[PDB]
Amino acid sequence: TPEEKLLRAIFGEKASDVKDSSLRVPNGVSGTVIDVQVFTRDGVEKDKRA
Amino acid sequence: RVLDATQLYLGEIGYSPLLTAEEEVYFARRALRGDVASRRRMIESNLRLVVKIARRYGNRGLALLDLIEEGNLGLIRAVEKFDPERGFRFSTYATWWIRQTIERAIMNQTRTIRLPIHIVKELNVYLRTARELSHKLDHEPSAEEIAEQLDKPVDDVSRMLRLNERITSVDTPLGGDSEKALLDILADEKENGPEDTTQDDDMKQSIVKWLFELNAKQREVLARRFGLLGYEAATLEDVGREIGLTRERVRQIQVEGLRRLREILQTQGLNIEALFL
DNA sequence: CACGTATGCTATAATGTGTGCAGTCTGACGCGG
DNA sequence: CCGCGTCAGACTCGTAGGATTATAGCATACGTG
RNA sequence: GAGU
Secondary structure (H helix, E strand, O other), rough: HHHHHHHHHHHHHOOOOOOOOOOOOOOOOOOOOOOOOOOOOOOOOOOOOO | OOOOHHHHHHHHHHOOHHHHHHHHHHHHHHHHOOOOOOOHHHHHHOHHHHHHHHHHHOOOOHHHHHHHHHHHHHHHHHHHHOOOOOOOOOHHHHHHHHHHHHHHHHHHHHHHOOOOOOHHHHHHHHHHHHHHHHHHHHOOOOHHHHHHHHHHOHHHHHHHHHOOOEEEEOOOOOOOOOOEEEEOOOOOOOOOOOOHHHHHHHHHHHHHHHHHOHHHHHHHHHHHOOOOOOOOOOHHHHHHHOOOOHHHHHHHHHHHHHHHHHHHHHHHOHHHHHHOO
């Protein structure tokens, strides 16, 4: 919107290419992470954690 | 009486006489000449062949009637391109056209999202290959195992298998229980809530108030150039031409007005900074 | 020209469907023979 | 009359995600960077 | 599977 054009011109803060779809703890449940499992396809570079 | 579409159609086809070779040749000479009647009689005499073939190709592609009509279209191509002089029988030639037309129809119409023939046929070779692999591996093959067999990229195989992913109905009720469908759960993500809508009101209105804090000249330059209080985002030349010739002076007043807003923000920005989430 | 999407022809003879389920509820109120 | 058909059949809560098949093989044709 |  023209307002955000003006505002992002003022502050610079040009919005980046990546968003955010991170898995987070569902609200009001709280606990301890006891295990993690990783599944990767045959060809994609594995994570350090994997 | 008898109200089935299919039964009625099959009865009608039944009441047309089957042709011999010499008859087909005689008829067909006149049909290439453009006899009209000859073409009609050859078509109608050979409809039963179409139904025999559509019977086979049916199964799960489409409705039997649908297959029959497309098959008829193939048979018509065959009657138009038949060669009576060549000793080969008509039924032999027609079979090719009928199967062809039916197959091509079921490659297009069957899929809700229309898949082009090249993609479909590629995908089919991936499938047949998967079947051979699965026989010998005992197991259904991975994407990379199929790719290793074809000596091709895994990304190619993957993209094709993604296209094969068939659709689910939004109306299908969930959990073997006629309780509620997918539609009942599935939100409109584009439509934000009353929260987001009210935040835009608040935002836009705070910007009006902030624009009025500045000079009459700065505020008007900003309004016209941003397209905020104006209609169109007037370029430097447009704003200058309406006010002060100097196109460069528009840039100067504009940048000056932005810096006065930054001052208001460092002073009272304690509200503005919280607009960052 | 290439890349993506389409239309096309192949020549032993072959010429009327079936298929996969449905399981049958109940008391009431109208509508052609 | 008999028979065949159509129309209805309580209200909120829950759980969990998910599945099938197969369409040849090759040459020409149309539209965009 | 939960009260009705």
